[PDB]
Amino acid sequence: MYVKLISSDGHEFIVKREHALTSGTIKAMLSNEVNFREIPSHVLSKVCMYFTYKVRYTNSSTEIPEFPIAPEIALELLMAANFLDC
């Protein structure tokens, strides 16, 4: 089961609902599509990678790789992550 997160510029990101629920904000918006008027797609795509990363590596004993963040998107990703509570 999937949900659709739409970026400020209209890109549609289709991710597993369980991955999207990493964000408590997204959980409330879903309780299915969500429109993010303030998160552009180059940020929202990284947020989606983060969900995948978080769900894959939470509770795993393997060595966990660093979640990589380009300096150029650090600030917007920070504000998106702050809003999304994740």
Partner: protein
């Protein structure tokens, strides 16, 4: 082995995972379950390269090294119109502002 993918067409991006041993066709069934277009109406690409339905994702270059949760590999998707396949078009994501001087 799980590989982590962004399946992309136009302004659509599907985040999903699949086994390295699964086939391009089985990925099309995944796409069909999500976007409701049957496999015969889909073409899947890595870069500009059309992918063979019977090939596994690993043989198509999707491996634990190249298709990571925090850095998924991109699969291009193109749909068939009326017996004619559209050209592969993937709209880029937006651009970040220029780096602040303070960074």
């Amino acid at each position: 082995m799980d590989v982590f993918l962004m399946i992309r067409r136009h302004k659509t991006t599907i985040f999903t995972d699949a086994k390295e041993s699964s086939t391009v066709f089985e990925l099309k069934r995944i796409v069909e379950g999500i976007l409701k277009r049957p496999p015969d109406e889909q073409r899947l690409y890595k870069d500009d390269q059309l992918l063979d339905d019977g090939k596994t994702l690993g043989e198509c270059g999707f491996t634990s090294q190249t298709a990571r949760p925090q850095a998924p590999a991109t699969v291009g998707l193109a749909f068939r119109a009326d017996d004619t396949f559209e050209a592969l078009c993937i709209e880029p994501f937006s651009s970040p502002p220029e780096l602040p001087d303070v960074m």
